């Protein structure tokens, strides 16, 4: 049978564990937020790069063909 | 606080910590997927920049050569 003081002791231990666990949760939530932002910007970066690259290669191929013609 | 009130608060703290641990593992799995996906996107971008540069540079030199060939014959 848990005593009144034992419940007070365990409650304090639980708050210390809870504070420690809440710190780790906010940390991994912070990491989640930056990882998602990095994910979305990398997709926007690789998309603009593909468009920039194909546009410039086409334009260069048009010069080469006209010069040959 | 009464003895039963203490049992309740203690039990409630335990249950909040279990709920918190569950959400932690959920988010951790998300971050593992995002780290994996971001690393590959960064390798894609490096590969694509390299190959586009090779193409553009090669195109620039063919354009240069064709202009110099023309002038040399005019």
UniProtKB/Swiss-Prot annotation, chain A:
Span of the signal peptide: none
UniProt-annotated location(s): Cytoplasm; Nucleus; Nucleus, PML body; Mitochondrion
Induction and repression of expression: By TNF which induces strong nuclear localization.
Top-level lineage group: Eukaryota
Quaternary assembly: Self-associates. Component of the death-inducing signaling complex (DISC) with CASP8, FADD and FAS. Interacts with NCOA2 and NCOA3. Interacts with SRRT. Interacts with TRAF2. Interacts with NPAT. Interacts (via SIM domains) with SUMO1 and SUMO2. Interacts with SP100; may negatively regulate CASP8AP2 export from the nucleus to the cytoplasm.
Its job: Participates in TNF-alpha-induced blockade of glucocorticoid receptor (GR) transactivation at the nuclear receptor coactivator level, upstream and independently of NF-kappa-B. Suppresses both NCOA2- and NCOA3-induced enhancement of GR transactivation. Involved in TNF-alpha-induced activation of NF-kappa-B via a TRAF2-dependent pathway. Acts as a downstream mediator for CASP8-induced activation of NF-kappa-B. Required for the activation of CASP8 in FAS-mediated apoptosis. Required for histone gene transcription and progression through S phase.
Protein name: CASP8-associated protein 2
Protein species of origin: Homo sapiens
Residues of the full protein shown: 70 to 137 of 1982
